[PDB]
Structures are given as structure tokens and as C-alpha cells.
Design a protein around this ligand. Sequence first.
Ligand code: W5J
Length: 167
Amino acid sequence: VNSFSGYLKLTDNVYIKNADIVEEAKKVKPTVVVNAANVYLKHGGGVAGALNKATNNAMQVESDDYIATNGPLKVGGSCVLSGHNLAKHCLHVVGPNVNKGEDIQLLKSAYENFNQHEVLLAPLLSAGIFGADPIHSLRVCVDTVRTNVYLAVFDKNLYDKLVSSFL
Ligand SMILES: CN(CCC(=O)O)c1ncnc2[nH]ccc12
């Protein structure tokens, strides 16, 4: 048993809810929250800017030190950093950004990072402002992630569309 509440069960291991991932993280304090990162860990908008703002910019300070030491992530890659006041850990995962021209086949590689963690609170990757079809992103998630994933879908109307269209 875990602390996640009000999720619809899609599969053996994937759950979904209409929720702000920031508010969900603050309430649950999960072991792992996933950030929808870019390779530079520049947290400007969407999940990254919202998560970073909720940490009072501590996520960005930590991320800048990580990049100064290690250089950029790969598209499809990840790193584990602090969860600050939101979670024990933040798994920063880089899905492909369609609005920058990246290979959508890299979305599966991105979701494979989740399999290194038993339980995660996460957003849909590569959708929203990254520009991918969220219905596709949910299908890749279900077909790739084997660990227990709790998906927070910010957009109300999209949540309803994802549930109604789920196969
Ligand atoms: C943007 N995005 C993913 C798109 C969606 O889920 O519709 C988010 N996902 C979950 N929580 C969030 N808080 C702020 C944004 C945000």
C-alpha cells in the first residue's frame, strides 16, 4: 500500500489522475517525482518551471552545478537529483521536444528511465509544450514502464480525453 489517492487504474502498474504534479508532490512527498526536463536542465515552463518555482529556485541552483560538472543530458536520458521540498528525489527525464525537431522514437528511451525506480509520480513526457501527442505519450508509457507510475495530468480537458480514448 502507498499514499497516492484518487487515481484511475489503467493497467497493472499505471495509474492516472487530473492533478497538478506540484500539488500532488507537496501532498504525497513521494520517493521520486519526475521532471519533464531539457538537456540543459533549464527549468522555464510547464512541469520544470512549475516544479522549480515550488522549490524557490533551489532545483535550478542544483541543476546548474550538475551541468557545470557533467555537461548536458542526452535526449532520452535522465539524472537523479534532489527532490527538495517536493519529494526525496527528482528524476529529471528528457523526452524529445517536437517543437525543436527531435526523434519521437526517443520517447520510449525516455520512459525506460522510469524502470530504475519502483514507484514514481510523473507527468506525461513530450506532450504539452514539447509538442508530442499526449495520447501517444500515454501509450508509450503503458507499453514501456513496468514499475508503478502515478501520472498527473494537469489539463482537465486532456485528462478526460486520455481516459475516454485509452485502449
Ligand atoms: C504541463 N504538464 C504536463 C501536461 C498535462 O498534464 O496536461 C503538467 N503536468 C502535471 N502537472 C503540471 N503542473 C504544471 C504543469 C503540469
